[PDB]
Ligand binder design. Structure first.
Ligand code: FES
Length: 103
């Protein structure tokens, strides 16, 4: 398929499954579907409002975070081992079925 499944759990504990395309960031999908993941700095790696926690399995599939993301993540509330900036995790076909939780 061209659709890539993304499972979202919101801070309220709601669970949503949506499909994205290659290139779509988790932040885009969030906005596209009224998941309340704010993107203060609009993808410029200058905030932490797009912080999401990805499942461990798909986490290792990802291009690891660059230095600007890592550093910014240190201001993110609720940081975990598999935390990422949602605007920096972009969908690929091998990431199908990825789970993101919004702290
Ligand atoms: S929107 Fe600010 S870092 Fe992703």
């Amino acid at each position: 398929g061209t659709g890539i499944k993304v499972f979202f759990v919101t801070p309220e504990g709601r669970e949503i499954m949506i499909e994205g395309n290659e290139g779509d960031s988790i932040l885009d999908l969030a906005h596209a579907n009224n998941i309340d993941l704010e993107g203060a700095c609009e993808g410029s790696v200058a905030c932490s409002t797009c912080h999401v926690i990805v499942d461990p399995e798909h986490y290792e599939l990802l291009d690891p975070p660059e230095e600007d993301e890592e550093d910014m993540l240190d201001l993110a509330f609720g940081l975990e081992e598999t935390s990422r900036l949602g605007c920096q995790v972009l969908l690929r076909k091998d990431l199908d079925g990825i789970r993101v939780r919004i702290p």
